[PDB]
Amino acid sequence: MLFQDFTHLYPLSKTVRFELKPIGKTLEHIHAKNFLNQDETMADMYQKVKAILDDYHRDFIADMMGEVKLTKLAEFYDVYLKFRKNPKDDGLQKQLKDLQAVLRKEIVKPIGNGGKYKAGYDRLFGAKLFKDGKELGDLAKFVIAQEGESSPKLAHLAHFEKFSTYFTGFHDNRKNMYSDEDKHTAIAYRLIHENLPRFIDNLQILATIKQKHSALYDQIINELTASGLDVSLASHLDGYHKLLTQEGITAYNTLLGGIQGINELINSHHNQHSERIAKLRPLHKQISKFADDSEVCQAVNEFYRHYADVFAKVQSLFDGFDDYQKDGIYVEYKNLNELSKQAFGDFALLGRVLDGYYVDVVNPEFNASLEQAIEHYTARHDDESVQAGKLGQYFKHGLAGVDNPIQKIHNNHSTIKGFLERERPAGERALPKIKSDKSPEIRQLKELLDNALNVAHFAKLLTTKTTLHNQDGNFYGEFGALYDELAKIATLYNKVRDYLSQKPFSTEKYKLNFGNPTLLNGWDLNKEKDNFGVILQKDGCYYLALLDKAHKKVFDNAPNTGKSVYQKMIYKLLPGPNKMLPKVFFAKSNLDYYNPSAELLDKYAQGTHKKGDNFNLKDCHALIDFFKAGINKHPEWQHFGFKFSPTSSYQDLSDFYREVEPQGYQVKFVDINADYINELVEQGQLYLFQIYNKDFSPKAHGKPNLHTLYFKALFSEDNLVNPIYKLNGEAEIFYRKASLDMNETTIHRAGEVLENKNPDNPKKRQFVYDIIKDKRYTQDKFMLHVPITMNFGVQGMTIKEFNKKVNQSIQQYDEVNVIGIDRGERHLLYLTVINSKGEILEQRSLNDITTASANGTQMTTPYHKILDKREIERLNARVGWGEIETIKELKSGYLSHVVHQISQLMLKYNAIVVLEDLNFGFKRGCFKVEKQIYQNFENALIKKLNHLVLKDKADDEIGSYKNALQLTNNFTDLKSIGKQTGFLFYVPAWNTSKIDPETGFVDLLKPRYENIAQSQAFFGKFDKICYNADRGYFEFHIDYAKFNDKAKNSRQIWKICSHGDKRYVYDKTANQNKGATIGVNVNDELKSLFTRYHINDKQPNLVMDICQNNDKEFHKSLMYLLKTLLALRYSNASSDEDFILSPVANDEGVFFNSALADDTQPQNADANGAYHIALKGLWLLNELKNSDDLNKVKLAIDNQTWLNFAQNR
RNA sequence: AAUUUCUACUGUUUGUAGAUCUGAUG
């Protein structure tokens, strides 16, 4: 009842796609006229015309450049040098970014408003690229493309004259090349941001004539290049617009690349013969399928082998890495963690080290902050090959982390460069096609390309997109041409990923236009002779009938009487009622019988927003009754059932256009005799298809498909009254040829017995008929992609409401329940439903999902046992690479079931679903569901609750297809998902997983041993450490005011006590190499090392007696036994057992063990991660209940506000 | 191991339960 008035709010369109079975002998008539082959060869020539148009774009780029005349190069020379203050970095980089913008305005200037090249362009719009003026190519590329009427060309361009609209999606991609914006696809990006910083960099190394000792030998470069390849194109700043074209850049890179070039001259005369000069970097040139097996075997025979790509250059360069200065070698912040994982330790060592030696210059005193911001993002990147830290306070002492780029290529070059022993099984035998096997001798080919991306990552640590002054130009000068060659492995490896991990079928379908350019662009109308397509009904099914070019006059005089007749749709429609009504406003005396000078001029200046800043009645009165009486005059919009409201009732012009939006769309059904229709389909005058999906079959008996329930709702008898759904124009009829053979796929024959895949079901069924795998792809079939529109006739909109409608409905409703969904470490997903008081209603894992209700039987499928079977499927080394996508295909398909489970949970409890915030709660551990996968779940949960209908519900209930729920905001804003989308809420997932859910206890202090000089000061901040002889456990009193990481919340005092058994988390060493989870017994181990190290513990208290012992293992193991106690979640080797045990007790005095017992409390450690998510949503409910003005309520959660709320509840 | 298409299937002897966009190189 919370979602009662949330039906029919905003309109959203969708596309419903079916098959088309050819009814009658119409497939033979289609094969007679050669429609399929015509559209097949046309979609074959589409690639060639696209390549011709790409060549035309290339020629247009080369003709457009050379007319720019940019004159800010000296100002960029002054401003850009000297690389603009990287310690300062704010206030001058902004003005440099403005200078880059005012420079890249000139690249898009000489065509827009310039008029040399005519701002409409006449050719980017694909309407008049074909058939204007009877020929257009006298100025255009056809004088190149003529070749005296070339036989491969011209004929291939003859098809795309009437069908010019195939390029309406292709021109959208080419429209981004000439963009003013700084998106990196543009032309002006690669000239001003790519090439221009590299041009000033390449010049300034060469402009050191008298700064270095190059005053003498500069001329002997210029005398040898006086024969050819003049350096004067590359030695002056004003000679940059010489090479704005593509033909200028290639002449420039011929000089720098060589073949004799300037790079080899300075290496032979100055380097080879203490100090070695740098090398210059070549500029960037400015603007596949891989289907056959012959291509990718010939591709990886020479495009990646030792002919083209050279790993001998990274060999000798990284062998002498120690000789170059490690001050000038730079490391970006993005690759700190990947550097620290591949070598020199763990994923968080260099983040610990860099912040460890930069936080000594900041002192948090006043505690708004203004110091913890500027210290963080600025100094975090050292940008040198680091000295591995001093760490003289004994922070995990180890050897150097700087000799590792030396050592990676020097790591037994047989092993680490494995291409040498993977060059023996090679060859290109004569082969058209082969089918992929699980393990042929191609596993060595993917492991050849496995080390390919590893070398690409080994050089990716020095990404360093600088633009920095003192960087080592000797190292980076060779590394600039080397890494840009080496960065094209990721594109090659992703394509052999796509080919070798293929399905046996193919999904390539070409659009059939039936010789008609405007086929199905509008439905049944006066203009049904243009669009050829009518819809028929035979009281069980819906038929798509297509006209013919010969006989377009069959349905003008059709028999209306008969038994068992086909109905025919009418579909009269007015498109754009606020747009088409001023398309009748412009008439001389056609509709303007009474054209007043008052009303016409008041429509011009005062037509926008109903008046020119006024709200009057009289001009709003004279406009409607002109339009109302104007509708009745012309015969086009006449005979419409326009039941208009009077002018006195409504004065808003938005209300008048709201009344003609439902009444503008009328669908009727007059019938036509069947034996008239059936007798002409066998002649060939009209084609009959049947719109067919699997629930239109006669054998079907289950619940119907979801999108079929929309298409059956298009032509219901309750769509005579005000329509909710709407049939849209511009449909399309695809055709998919046979991509599979019968004998190729494994089939199950007649009388064969089959075993059930799921571990629960043991039964076996006989199946007397044959079952063919991929029966859809065995035989070729048509398609039809019908677009529909829901809530047509409603005018409302998106987030302009500021979610006032959702928030107001929550406050008037009483006793709302909260739903929290979070990831699990041992569960796939976990759910917990919480009332307003804060107690669990139900808590159930999503490992097992039971919605499978065929006819009252429920089938529970284990998705955890399937993922166990998928994980061993990926374990096999000698196998293909495509089993990693089968798990991603499953997780994309598993979450589609989960979206159903939540939408039935929301209806049962009138609940609110609260998910984690991926923007600032994304820092998480390892999980069974990834982070890029979980965004697809959080996106598909929005698109479902846009138009939520329940299939089993009757049509009277709220939630059927008649009354569809509109629970979330419209998905036009798909990127910005912040803190609210309708009923969905988004809370930060930090500090939710490990909290004692009874008392709200989180470990705010972190016991970590760094130095024993201040480990004495750590234990001295404890209030009282004693031993309870009567109770039986130790007593670590604390006070969070004395420690650091100060917390504003309540309960600054605590009482850490010991227990019976704490199954310790995985902590292992090379020697410890074991099952790696060694469970500890803390309370007797605290009785240990006290009698061992000769310290009495009977005296209350014994907090200062810890501080007089410096055994170096007493203070170290007291950290190990306190890190066990303060960690709250515990995971053992037994995978079924995962739990939470808390040190601190309640007010009553019992401790929380999640295993014993489960009384309306979180069952395990995965339930607690979902219980504290829904507690964060309970606080967002308590803000709305405490909001007297709901306009600007901020639902954000501070970290101390949640801690103060969780433990004072 | 059957589907407009995806996922899990066997879920009355040519099928069952969810989900499903639309246009398109990284």
PDB file of N, CA and C in Angstrom, chain A residues 55 159 205 207 258 271 275 294 296-297 316 384 394 508 600 633 646 891 909 921 989 999 1067 1098 1133 1140-1141 1202:
ATOM      1  N   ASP A  55      37.644   6.913 -46.490  1.00  0.00           N
ATOM      2  CA  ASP A  55      38.658   7.557 -47.327  1.00  0.00           C
ATOM      3  C   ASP A  55      38.260   8.987 -47.683  1.00  0.00           C
ATOM      4  N   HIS A 159      23.879   1.094 -55.211  1.00  0.00           N
ATOM      5  CA  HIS A 159      22.833   0.576 -54.335  1.00  0.00           C
ATOM      6  C   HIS A 159      22.343   1.649 -53.371  1.00  0.00           C
ATOM      7  N   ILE A 205      64.759  19.611 -26.686  1.00  0.00           N
ATOM      8  CA  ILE A 205      65.962  18.787 -26.603  1.00  0.00           C
ATOM      9  C   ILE A 205      66.939  19.176 -27.702  1.00  0.00           C
ATOM     10  N   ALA A 207      66.797  22.165 -29.272  1.00  0.00           N
ATOM     11  CA  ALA A 207      67.076  23.596 -29.224  1.00  0.00           C
ATOM     12  C   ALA A 207      68.197  23.942 -28.256  1.00  0.00           C
ATOM     13  N   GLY A 258      63.785   7.857 -39.224  1.00  0.00           N
ATOM     14  CA  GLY A 258      64.925   7.538 -40.054  1.00  0.00           C
ATOM     15  C   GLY A 258      64.576   6.682 -41.259  1.00  0.00           C
ATOM     16  N   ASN A 271      76.904   9.584 -29.380  1.00  0.00           N
ATOM     17  CA  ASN A 271      76.734   8.491 -28.371  1.00  0.00           C
ATOM     18  C   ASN A 271      77.757   7.331 -28.452  1.00  0.00           C
ATOM     19  N   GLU A 275      78.584  11.143 -20.963  1.00  0.00           N
ATOM     20  CA  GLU A 275      77.398  11.934 -21.265  1.00  0.00           C
ATOM     21  C   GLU A 275      76.881  11.512 -22.633  1.00  0.00           C
ATOM     22  N   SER A 294      41.820 -18.585 -40.970  1.00  0.00           N
ATOM     23  CA  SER A 294      43.012 -18.311 -41.767  1.00  0.00           C
ATOM     24  C   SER A 294      43.651 -16.987 -41.373  1.00  0.00           C
ATOM     25  N   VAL A 296      43.676 -15.225 -38.251  1.00  0.00           N
ATOM     26  CA  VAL A 296      44.338 -15.065 -36.958  1.00  0.00           C
ATOM     27  C   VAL A 296      45.511 -16.034 -36.835  1.00  0.00           C
ATOM     28  N   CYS A 297      45.578 -17.032 -37.719  1.00  0.00           N
ATOM     29  CA  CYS A 297      46.777 -17.858 -37.780  1.00  0.00           C
ATOM     30  C   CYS A 297      47.848 -17.182 -38.622  1.00  0.00           C
ATOM     31  N   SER A 316      67.910  -5.161 -23.950  1.00  0.00           N
ATOM     32  CA  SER A 316      69.184  -4.503 -23.672  1.00  0.00           C
ATOM     33  C   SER A 316      68.991  -3.197 -22.911  1.00  0.00           C
ATOM     34  N   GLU A 384      59.909   8.912  -8.104  1.00  0.00           N
ATOM     35  CA  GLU A 384      61.249   8.427  -8.378  1.00  0.00           C
ATOM     36  C   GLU A 384      61.270   6.932  -8.110  1.00  0.00           C
ATOM     37  N   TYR A 394      62.668  -0.398  12.476  1.00  0.00           N
ATOM     38  CA  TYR A 394      62.345  -1.810  12.219  1.00  0.00           C
ATOM     39  C   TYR A 394      60.895  -1.987  11.759  1.00  0.00           C
ATOM     40  N   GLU A 508      24.976 -12.904 -36.735  1.00  0.00           N
ATOM     41  CA  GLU A 508      25.019 -11.819 -37.710  1.00  0.00           C
ATOM     42  C   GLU A 508      23.746 -11.844 -38.546  1.00  0.00           C
ATOM     43  N   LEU A 600      -2.098  36.346 -34.268  1.00  0.00           N
ATOM     44  CA  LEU A 600      -0.893  35.863 -34.939  1.00  0.00           C
ATOM     45  C   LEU A 600       0.362  36.469 -34.321  1.00  0.00           C
ATOM     46  N   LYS A 633     -11.941  21.543 -39.258  1.00  0.00           N
ATOM     47  CA  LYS A 633     -12.047  21.996 -40.644  1.00  0.00           C
ATOM     48  C   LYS A 633     -11.399  21.017 -41.618  1.00  0.00           C
ATOM     49  N   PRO A 646     -13.877  22.272 -22.228  1.00  0.00           N
ATOM     50  CA  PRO A 646     -14.118  23.684 -22.550  1.00  0.00           C
ATOM     51  C   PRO A 646     -12.937  24.570 -22.174  1.00  0.00           C
ATOM     52  N   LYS A 891      27.187 -15.258 -13.930  1.00  0.00           N
ATOM     53  CA  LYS A 891      26.950 -14.212 -12.936  1.00  0.00           C
ATOM     54  C   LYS A 891      26.128 -13.073 -13.521  1.00  0.00           C
ATOM     55  N   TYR A 909       6.507  -6.775   2.082  1.00  0.00           N
ATOM     56  CA  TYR A 909       6.685  -6.044   3.329  1.00  0.00           C
ATOM     57  C   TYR A 909       6.435  -4.549   3.203  1.00  0.00           C
ATOM     58  N   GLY A 921      31.995   3.625  -1.287  1.00  0.00           N
ATOM     59  CA  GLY A 921      32.052   2.454  -0.437  1.00  0.00           C
ATOM     60  C   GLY A 921      32.580   1.274  -1.223  1.00  0.00           C
ATOM     61  N   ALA A 989      29.452   1.537   2.399  1.00  0.00           N
ATOM     62  CA  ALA A 989      29.646   0.207   2.959  1.00  0.00           C
ATOM     63  C   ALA A 989      30.856   0.105   3.872  1.00  0.00           C
ATOM     64  N   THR A 999      26.128  -4.477  20.887  1.00  0.00           N
ATOM     65  CA  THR A 999      26.547  -3.232  21.516  1.00  0.00           C
ATOM     66  C   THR A 999      27.127  -2.211  20.548  1.00  0.00           C
ATOM     67  N   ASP A1067      46.659 -16.406   8.194  1.00  0.00           N
ATOM     68  CA  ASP A1067      47.934 -15.706   8.294  1.00  0.00           C
ATOM     69  C   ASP A1067      49.031 -16.751   8.152  1.00  0.00           C
ATOM     70  N   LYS A1098      49.206 -11.697  38.837  1.00  0.00           N
ATOM     71  CA  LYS A1098      48.199 -11.715  39.892  1.00  0.00           C
ATOM     72  C   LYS A1098      47.861 -10.306  40.366  1.00  0.00           C
ATOM     73  N   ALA A1133      38.887 -23.097   8.080  1.00  0.00           N
ATOM     74  CA  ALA A1133      39.083 -23.962   6.921  1.00  0.00           C
ATOM     75  C   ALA A1133      37.788 -24.667   6.535  1.00  0.00           C
ATOM     76  N   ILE A1140      31.049 -14.627  13.871  1.00  0.00           N
ATOM     77  CA  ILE A1140      31.508 -13.418  14.541  1.00  0.00           C
ATOM     78  C   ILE A1140      31.403 -13.641  16.039  1.00  0.00           C
ATOM     79  N   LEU A1141      32.501 -13.397  16.749  1.00  0.00           N
ATOM     80  CA  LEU A1141      32.532 -13.463  18.202  1.00  0.00           C
ATOM     81  C   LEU A1141      33.127 -12.151  18.686  1.00  0.00           C
ATOM     82  N   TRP A1202      27.058   7.415  12.157  1.00  0.00           N
ATOM     83  CA  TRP A1202      26.597   6.031  12.125  1.00  0.00           C
ATOM     84  C   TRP A1202      27.084   5.267  13.349  1.00  0.00           C
TER      85      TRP A1202
END
